C-alpha cells in the first residue's frame with residue numbers, strides 16, 4: 001500500500017501517486033516537473049543528483065533492489081522515517097526509476 005513515485009534519468013518527477021500526495025504534502029501537479037530532491041533534507045538533497053549520476057555511470061546499486069530506511073521531508077519542513085525501494089525500467093530507450101515509499105510513522 002506504499003506511495004509510488006517515478007522519475008526520469010535526471011531525477012525529475014514524472015508521476016506522483018495519490019499516497020505520495022498525502023505523505024509529502026505536494027499535489028501531483030506541483031510535484032511533477034520538480035527534482036525528486038525536494039522530498040528530502042540535507043545533505044542528501046544537495047547530493048541526490050550525484051547519487052543518480054553515480055549509479056548510471058557505474059551500474060553499481062546501493063538502494064536499487066536492496067532497500068533502505070531513510071528520512072523524507074514533507075512540504076511543511078518536517079522530517080519522517082520512511083522505507084525506500086527502487087526499481088529501474090526502460091521506455092523509448094530512456095531510463096526511468098520507480099520508487100516505493102512506506103512512511104514508518
Ligand code: HEM
Pocket residue numbers: 005006007036039040041044048051052055060061062063064070071072073084086097098099100
Ligand atoms: C524521499 C527521500 C529520499 C532519500 C532520503 C533518498 C536517499 C538516497 C540515498 C541515501 C542514495 C544513495 C545511497 C548510497 O549511495 O549509499 C540514493 C540513491 C538513489 N535514489 Fe534516492 N532518495 C529518496 C527518494 C528517492 C526516490 C523516490 C527515487 C526514485 C523514484 C530515488 C531514486 C534514487 C536512485 C535512482 C538512486 C541511485 C541508485 C542507487 O544508488 O542504488 N530516490 N537515494
Ligand SMILES: [Cl-]
Pocket residue numbers: 065066067068084085086
Ligand atoms: Cl527493498
Ligand SMILES: [Cl-]
Pocket residue numbers: 066067068069
Ligand atoms: Cl531495508
Ligand code: NA
Pocket residue numbers: 028029030031032033034
Ligand atoms: Na508541475
Ligand code: NA
Pocket residue numbers: 066067068
Ligand atoms: Na534493505
